Amino acid sequence: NNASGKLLALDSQLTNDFSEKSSYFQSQVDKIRKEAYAGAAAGVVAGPFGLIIS
């Protein structure tokens, strides 16, 4: 009966933390988008060539 409860207890936590890591992932992807387009933002020290190659 002890491990019978331990099973369900771990299961609910698993199901919660799956979606919580999913939320972490979606918060992470757009962060990486912002960081990428921000690293590509300051490439204007060159002319129009440095823009499009960035």
Partner: peptide, 26 residues
């Protein structure tokens, strides 16, 4: 001198990155 102006352009882009980060984080 070409060495020196590329040397100074490095610290130029460094400080521009510093200022751009300090602005964009705000």
């Amino acid at each position: 001198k070409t060495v020196e102006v590329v040397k100074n352009a490095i610290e130029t882009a460094d400080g521009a990155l510093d200022l751009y980060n300090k602005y964009l984080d705000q």
